[model samples]
Target: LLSPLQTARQLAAEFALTAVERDERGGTPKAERDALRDSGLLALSIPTRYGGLGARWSETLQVVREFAKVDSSIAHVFGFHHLMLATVRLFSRPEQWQPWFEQTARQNWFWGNALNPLDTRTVVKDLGGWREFSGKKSFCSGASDSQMLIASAVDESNGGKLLIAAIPSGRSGITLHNDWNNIGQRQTDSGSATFERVRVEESELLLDPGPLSTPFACLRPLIAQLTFTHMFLGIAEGAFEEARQYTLSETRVWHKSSVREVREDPYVLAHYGEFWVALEGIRLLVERAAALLDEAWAKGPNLSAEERGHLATAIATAKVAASRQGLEICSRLFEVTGARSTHASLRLDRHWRNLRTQTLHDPLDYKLHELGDWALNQSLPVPTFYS
Candidate 1:
């Protein structure tokens, strides 16, 4: 009967035990996936009325951070599950979302992401009673093991409007290609999925209120941004902890050290200090952004564009800070761990590899430009999926 946070912490400890092997193997984590489902965490964000645990965004995000501390690949899929659910929650009418929520809670369904609007290959054709999705999408993270997909297609007849829907991953004419052989996040199954006239019913589409239709609706991307922010921070924390443990238990004092033990070395202590301070500062920024997101989430449609903009800026600030510092901490981790830590058995570099790979998913260069504009002038970023 543990809470979602407690369950996440427990699972993180277990996942840490084999994270290295899992990362090296680089494929679907069947056991780990089952562990998540059996833990009842899939229902973490669903509302109570829909048979879910009804946790808030802040709590769920904390769980994501906890998982990322040990396994960011696992954390990525877990975080995206909530993101997809939130997409359903925000984009559609209550009636439209209710059944999906209930089914998700009841079946412990794991949602995969396919709504890549930037990849314009997927298109929709209007049939008499329904629309059909055709073509492919890239970066379909967690699509391999998922039961449902947050799919999207563009309608050229309607000003190229981006249409989104929820459909069964096992539906006819749908194919999930296991081609996500990237440098990192190998187990995420973030490959390619193709829809061959996959049927999309009017009921399946998330268009009642629609995405980015209002200030509240725009929180989808903020939620997404914060998810990555927490993952980065958590990975940084993981590297910090891993380095600390190695130094304390295994690493020896340098030959000419002024101290008898590795931990007592002033230089080592100084490295830890920088790591600690950097992590502490970003933790503040990330948590503040999370709190602001929770507030905006509560405001619903009553939320204004200005308030959403402020929240976005906060999230972007945290995102950039986390990405910058997380990468550095992961790289500098080797400095304290020494060359022996670089052994393939250690696999400490997985932290850096995962962050390095995942950070490229969205560029911080544009994020910086948006933040700079906000700092110099008072222009709030226009709401979009990425923004």
Candidate 2:
């Protein structure tokens, strides 16, 4: 097995090839989506024994960021697969691993996350010697691209315990509803889905009805943190590259200045330097947080409450810093790129749109609260990535 760095470098290169394809295929081509999915880059975190590289989350973050720079839609969609895989591997029952693990270890079967953003309930019934679930799930990502999905619902019979279920995507009761019309991440197909009267066997309920728990929530923030940071960083990096060239190339004799280029302005240089410093700080914060997560996962089941809190706080800090800085950097670039950048051909605003949507996926204040509470009260709450 290759080290995490080796795996990330290989995956990033593979995703780089799909950047343009991802843009052209946006919202219309099932062929393009399937092609990217089948490329095996989607399973970066699946254990090598299970047909994945078993990469570290830090490495996966780097790959995702690099991909997002070129195609936010594609990276955003594939990031869900990583989240589902990580969560399942970390929390699922031991007996549930055989067939799915073998199938993944052998062939590329992309997974989707059908986590309900609103309705958090699990409904189950006995239907003709099988179990049936019927509920509404929100924010189901990669609806058309994936063959499998992991869903969550509150257990009706058990007074609101979250139940975990994994099932085939093309089954009878699995319906993808077209509700997402967001301006950004438009190609991700991250909308709602209704699993109406979907009959599932005991085998499909892969994980038992258990506590979602503080630890799971704690670990979850790191996943979201890594995802948001990588995507936004990619956007910033791409925007800076385009904007830098645009500014230098556009010779401006603004308001009686005959010989001065925009690049010569001290104000622009100062702003660029500030944003660059902020970006560097964000990277350092995330790397430190990632190290803590590596340690926690390395310790595995032996993790202590303090360690979990520390890990969660570290994750929150990274997310908050990256979100705040990324937004500022992208906004600054808009000023430098100027009015012509708004032209359809330039696509500079794409970065701004992506950064806006991604940063709002979780509130920054909530994330800061996680860190603040940990620091001031020594009272750790559940993990909230950007809060």
Candidate 3:
């Protein structure tokens, strides 16, 4: 049937058809998630041998970008699916992950995330013969709609060492709060999830070189950064395109303008040129970072700290660029499109609101500081959730 990008383009259109309405009435998008599962896009990043499309990072991120152009909430959850898939692959041995991959493909499983390390309330305990997890994880995106979740907790013994597990979303004792009421990215289902003494089998835990345990392990955060970069880049492109179309069509020329059409207005053209440069620059950076990540992924255990550090730096540079420019472009769209485009029914401001909310996920100052230290002092950032 359709190529992956072609499929994404069609889905993007479908998502766009209801993006504004969904944004207005915010909640988990159960219907949209079902549509995505039916579309077979969930299997893009899994290997062909596992009954998947075997798409690469470049292709998958491109699809994410396309979706971001329409609705970033859907894009966020979709991209997170691939990120969590990569997590299972990166943290576990081939033998351990292959079955999960096969199962994911067989069921067209949509993955969620409950691995928010920030909420330290989540604790894992050894219960003589088995293990149990209990506590609440905030910002659990896609949890309401997903069948599987990649989760984490601190071990009560052993000085609170971190432990990771892959568990069923609907497993007994797991509860979803449905409390994500943010102003933007409203339908991501990024609410809170509580686990009340949830049973976690020994097979479910990821023990081989657990979270950020090695140079390669640290690449987990880099995957997250790259996803954010693509999302921001996509937002910039989407806002620019929307504003460009509006300017070309309905926008009226200002009284002081020398040109008859808004598109020909000198100020508007100048701003559009700036937006183009900003988006293209970040796009190039993201592509380069993806290439580096691909090479590192192939390296696997052999990936050196220096190489991983380099990849992180490249991704951080792109992340910083996209975050700043994405906000700028989204905010400036109103400037170029004129006052009439601000009509509430158009919902043009959703771009800015979404970007604003997303940019707050991590601080840009830290990215800039780390990049500067790397640039001048040769100090690579130690991996954590944000970095």
Candidate 1, residue 316: the lDDT equals 95
Writing each residue's lDDT as its tens digit, candidate 1 over 1-387 gives 787888889999999999999898888988999999999999999989899999889889999899999999899999999999999999998888889999999999999999897899999999989989999899999888899999999999757999999999899989999888977888889999889999999999999789879999889988998999999999999988998889878887789989898878888888888888889889999999999988988898899989999999999999999999989999987888886888899889999999999898788899999999999988899888888
Tell me how far the alpha carbon of residue 122 in candidate 3 is from the true structure, in angstroms, after superposition.
Answer: 1.0
**Backbone Cα, N, C clashes tallied per candidate:** 0, 9, 0
lDDT of 3 by residue, 1-387 (tens): 899999999989888888888889999788889988988889899999998899888788888889999899999999999888888887877777789899998898999989987788999889877789999899998888789999998997766888999999999999999999998889989999899999998778888767887877888889888997889888888888888889888889999889887867888888888988988898899899989988887787888999998999999999888899889999988888888998888899999999999988888887788999998999988888777
Q: Across residues 142-230, which tens digit of lDDT does each residue of candidate 2 receive? A: 77657778776666564565566778888898888757667677678778788788877777674532324446444654675677677
- Highest TM-score among the candidates is held by which one? 1
Q: Candidate 1 clash total?
A: 0
Ranking by TM-score: 1, 3, 2
Worst 10 residues of 2 by lDDT: 208-217
lDDT of 2 at 72: 74
The reply for model 2, stretches above 4 Å from the true place, is 1-32, 126-129, 206-218, 251-259, 383-387
The residue ranges of model 1 lying beyond 4 angstroms of the native Cα positions read: none
Question: Candidates sorted by lDDT, descending order?
Answer: 1, 3, 2
